[PDB]
Amino acid sequence: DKISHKIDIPDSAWTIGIGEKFKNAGHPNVKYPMIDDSYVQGAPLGGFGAGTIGRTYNGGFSRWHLEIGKNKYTTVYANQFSVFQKVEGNKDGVAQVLYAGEPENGYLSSWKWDYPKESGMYYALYPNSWYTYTNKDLPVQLAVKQFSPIIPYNYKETSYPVAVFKWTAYNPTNKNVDVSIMFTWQNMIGFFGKQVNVNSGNFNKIIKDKSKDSEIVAAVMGNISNDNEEWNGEYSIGVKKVPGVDISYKAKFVTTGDGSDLWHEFSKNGILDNKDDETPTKQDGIGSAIAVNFKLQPGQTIEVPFALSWDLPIMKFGGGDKWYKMYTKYFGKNGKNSFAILKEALNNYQKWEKMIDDWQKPILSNKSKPDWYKTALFNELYYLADGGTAWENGKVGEKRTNNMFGLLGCFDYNYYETLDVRFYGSFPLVMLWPDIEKQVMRQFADTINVQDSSEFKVGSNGAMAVKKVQGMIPHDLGSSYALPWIKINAYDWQNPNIWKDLNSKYVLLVYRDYVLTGKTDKEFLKYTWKSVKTALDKLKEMDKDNDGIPDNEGIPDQTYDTWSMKGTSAYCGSLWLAALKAAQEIGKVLKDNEAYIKYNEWYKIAQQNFEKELWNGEYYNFDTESDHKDSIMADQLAGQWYADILRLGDILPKDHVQKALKKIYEFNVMKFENGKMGAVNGMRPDGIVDESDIQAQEVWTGVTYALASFMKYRGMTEEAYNTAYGVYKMTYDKSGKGYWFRTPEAWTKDGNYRASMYMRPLSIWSMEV
Ligand SMILES: OC[C@H]1O[C@@H](O[C@H]2[C@H](O)[C@@H](O)[C@H](O[C@H]3[C@H](O)[C@@H](O)[C@H](O)O[C@@H]3CO)O[C@@H]2CO)[C@H](O)[C@@H](O)[C@@H]1O
Ligand SMILES: [Ca+2]
Numbered sequence: 001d002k003i004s005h006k007i008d009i010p011d012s013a014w015t016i017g018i019g020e021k022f023k024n025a026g027h028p029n030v031k032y033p034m035i036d037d038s039y040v041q042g043a044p045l046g047g048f049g050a051g052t053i054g055r056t057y058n059g060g061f062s063r064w065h066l067e068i069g070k071n072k073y074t075t076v077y078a079n080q081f082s083v084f085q086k087v088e089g090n091k092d093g094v095a096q097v098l099y100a101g102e103p104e105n106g107y108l109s110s111w112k113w114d115y116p117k118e119s120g121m122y123y124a125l126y127p128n129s130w131y132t133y134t135n136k137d138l139p140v141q142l143a144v145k146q147f148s149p150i151i152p153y154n155y156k157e158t159s160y161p162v163a164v165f166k167w168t169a170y171n172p173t174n175k176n177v178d179v180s181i182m183f184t185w186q187n188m189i190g191f192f193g194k195q196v197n198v199n200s201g202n203f204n205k206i207i208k209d210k211s212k213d214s215e216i217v218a219a220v221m222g223n224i225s226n227d228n229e230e231w232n233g234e235y236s237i238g239v240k241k242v243p244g245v246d247i248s249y250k251a252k253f254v255t256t257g258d259g260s261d262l263w264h265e266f267s268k269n270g271i272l273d274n275k276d277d278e279t280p281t282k283q284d285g286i287g288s289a290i291a292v293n294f295k296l297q298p299g300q301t302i303e304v305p306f307a308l309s310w311d312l313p314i315m316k317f318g319g320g321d322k323w324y325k326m327y328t329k330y331f332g333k334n335g336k337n338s339f340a341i342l343k344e345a346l347n348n349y350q351k352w353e354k355m356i357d358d359w360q361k362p363i364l365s366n367k368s369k370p371d372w373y374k375t376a377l378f379n380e381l382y383y384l385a386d387g388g389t390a391w392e393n394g395k396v397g398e399k400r401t402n403n404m405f406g407l408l409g410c411f412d413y414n415y416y417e418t419l420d421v422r423f424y425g426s427f428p429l430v431m432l433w434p435d436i437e438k439q440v441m442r443q444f445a446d447t448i449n450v451q452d453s454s455e456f457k458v459g460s461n462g463a464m465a466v467k468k469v470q471g472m473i474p475h476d477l478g479s480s481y482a483l484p485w486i487k488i489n490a491y492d493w494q495n496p497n498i499w500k501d502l503n504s505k506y507v508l509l510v511y512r513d514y515v516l517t518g519k520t521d522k523e524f525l526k527y528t529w530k531s532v533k534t535a536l537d538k539l540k541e542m543d544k545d546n547d548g549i550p551d552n553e554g555i556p557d558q559t560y561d562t563w564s565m566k567g568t569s570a571y572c573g574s575l576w577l578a579a580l581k582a583a584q585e586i587g588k589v590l591k592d593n594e595a596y597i598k599y600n601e602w603y604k605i606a607q608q609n610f611e612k613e614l615w616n617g618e619y620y621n622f623d624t625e626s627d628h629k630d631s632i633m634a635d636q637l638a639g640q641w642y643a644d645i646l647r648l649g650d651i652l653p654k655d656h657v658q659k660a661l662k663k664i665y666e667f668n669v670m671k672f673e674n675g676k677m678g679a680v681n682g683m684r685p686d687g688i689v690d691e692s693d694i695q696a697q698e699v700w701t702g703v704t705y706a707l708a709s710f711m712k713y714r715g716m717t718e719e720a721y722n723t724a725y726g727v728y729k730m731t732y733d734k735s736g737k738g739y740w741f742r743t744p745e746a747w748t749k750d751g752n753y754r755a756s757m758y759m760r761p762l763s764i765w766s767m768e769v
Helices: 260-269 338-364 371-379 382-386 419-425 427-432 434-447 502-515 522-540 570-589 593-614 638-646 654-669 701-713 717-732 760-768
Strands: 014-017 052-055 061-065 080-087 094-097 120-125 128-133 141-147 162-170 177-186 202-210 215-223 234-240 245-254 286-296 301-311 314-316 322-325 390-395 452-457 464-468 552-555 565-567
Touching (some): 094 260, 120 371, 141 338, 162 177, 177 234, 202 245, 234 338, 245 260, 260 286, 286 301, 338 371, 371 717, 371 760, 382 760, 419 502, 419 701, 419 760, 427 434, 434 502, 434 522, 502 522, 502 570, 522 570, 522 593, 570 593, 570 638, 638 701, 701 760, 717 760
Antiparallel strands (some): 014 120, 052 061, 162 301, 177 286, 215 234, 234 301, 245 286, 314 322, 452 464, 552 565
C-alpha cells in the first residue's frame, strides 16, 4: 500500500477490507418480519431530501432510498467503476470491475467481476468515504474519495442529489503504465414509481461542455416523456478533464445483455468508441459509460474528478400527495437539470471538501478524545440523509415561506419525526442545522389543537380510540405510506393521546432549541408559547391522586411502548418536573407572570412528592405501583439530563443524582455482559436483568448515548465513555454485530437486534453540547 500516503484519510475513519466476510453478524430478534439487509453496507451518497444511494464497502450501488421513505436493497450491477492497466512493453493489459462480487444471472457476463480479497480497503468518516486498490496485478495503485456536500449551517448544497468521486492514481513501479478509469451507470428511469413499460422511452445523450480551461463530458440518462411524475427525471454521470488525461465515452450499452458491446472496447486499450446514440429503448435496459485514459510515468501522481447526479424532482407518498424536493429551489422543478447539478459539483468539489474539513476539524484535532468516539460521532450522522428524509419545496399543483421537513424514526416503524424518539435523535439538527430543527418544532406546535374524532383500532389491545385529541402532542407527523405532514398519528400500536411523555418532551424540545441556539430567538418562543401552556395544562389533568404529577395507567403509555408504568414513574415524572421548570423560564422571558407563578407552584409540589415517592437511598424507583417498581431503570432521570442541557439547574438533589448514575453504571452497564454492550434498560436490585418485558432486557442505543452525555456533564468521564464504548463496539468493531450504517434501536444480550436504521442513536451528539 503506497497510495495511502498520497491521500488524506483520517485515523478515525471506520475501515474494512474490500471483499471482507464478516462472521459475527446479528439478525432481528422479533417474531414478525423485520428488515435485515446484511452487513454489506456503506456511507450514503446524496443530500437531505434528495433521495440517497448506499454504496457498500464492496463497491456496489446497493441500498436505494431514492423512493422517499422506502428502503430497497438490491445491487444494480451495471453501476460501477472499472480499471484498465497496461505496462509499456507488454502486449496485453488487464481490465477489472472494482466490485467484490458478480451478478446473479447472465447479464454483463463479459465483464471481469470478483475483485479479489486482500487487495484494497474501504474507509468511512461521514460524509466522506474512500476506497484504496492495492492489487498485485495492478501496478498503478488507485484510491477514490467520494462524498456529498453535507455542511452544517448550509441549507443549499446540503440538499443536492449529487456525489463526487475524486480519484488519485500513483505509479510506484519503474515502468510507464497506461491507465483507464471508467464509470458505468444504468439509465434507472423506471427503477421505481412506474407501473408498466419500465424501460420504455429511456434514452441517453452526451453533453460536451467546453469553455476555456474547462472540459466536462457527461452522459444524461432520461426519458423521452415530459410527464411530471415521481418516476421521471434524469441521472447523469461525468468527468472533468485535467492535464494529462483524455476522455472517452459510450452513450448506449445494453444492461440486459452480456455487456460485451462496451467491455470489448474497454478491455482492449481502455478507450471507448465515442459513439453518441439517442435512440430510445423499448424493453431492454440501457446505460452509459464515461472513461479517462492517461499514461503514468514512474513516481507520477494524477488526480481526476468524476460525479454522479440525479434529478428526480417529485416525491410521492402512498396517500397520493406529490411534493417537490428541496433541491428544486436551486435547479428547477422540470426534471431536466441533472447536467446543471453535475457541473456545479465538478466545478466546486474542492471548495466543498474544504467546507467539510472546516466543520470536522474542531473535533478531529481535539486529541483528548479517542478515535473510536470520533468514528461514531461522525458516522452516526449517516442517518440524517439515510432516514427517509423528506424536505418539500411545494405541493405539486400549488408558494409558502417555509419548507416542511421530516426524518423517519425508522423504516420498520415508518413514522415521520416520532417525537418520543426525536427527544433523543434531534441533537444533530439543533446543533448543526437549527433552521430545520425550529421548522420541525413549529410543525408540532401547529398540531397541538388539531382534533380528529375518527377512530382507529389500537394494536396492543384491540380497543378503539380517537385519532387525535385537542391539546395532546402527536406521536408523529404521518407515514411515507400515507400522508406526511397532513395526516398525523400514523402510529397505532398504542394510543399516543394518553401518553405521559409526549407533552413534556415537546416542551423540553422547545426550550432546548431556544437555549442551544444562543437564547436569542424570542420569536420562536412566542410562536410556540400557547402550545407549551396547553400541553402542560392537559397533562396535569392526568394526575389521578392529586400528588401534582401525571399517573402512568398500568399500560405502556410512553416511549417504552411494551413496558408498563403505573403511578408516578421516574421517567415520566422527571420529564414532567423538567418541563415545568422550562415553562417557568419561558414565562419569565416572555413576561407571562401568571404562567411563571402557576408552573412554579406545580413544580414545587411535584418535586417534593417525586422525591418522597421514589427516592430509596441509592436510586430512584422505576415507579410507585408496578410489580417490579424497584427496578433500576437506565433512563430514570431523563428529565434531569435535559435540565443539565437546558441549564435549568437541579430539579433533584445533586447527591441523589450522582448516586443514581453510579448505580446505573454499576448495575445496568457493568453487570450486563461485562459493560461491553451499553446500558440494559431494566435491572433488578439483585443484579439480574428485569424480565417483566422485552424492553427491560434490551439495550437502547440512543438511551445509552444520552446516558453517556448525562454522565459526562456530571463529571463521570470514565463512566460516560465506557458506557458509550459498548455501543460503538457492537456497531463498528470486528468483535461487534455488524451494524455499521444501520444502527438499530436495540439489542438483547445475544447481540441480535430490533429495528435497524434508527433515529434515536443520533443522541451521541448530546455528548458534544
Ligand atoms: O407498530 C410499532 C411498534 O411495534 C411493536 O411490535 C409489535 C408489532 O407491531 C405487532 O405486529 C406484533 O404483533 C404480534 C401480536 O401482538 C401477537 O398477538 C401475534 O401473535 O403476533 C404478532 C406478530 O407476529 O406485536 C409486536 C409486539 O410484540 C414494537 O414492540 C414497538 O416498540 C413498536 O413501536
Ligand atoms: Ca399523580
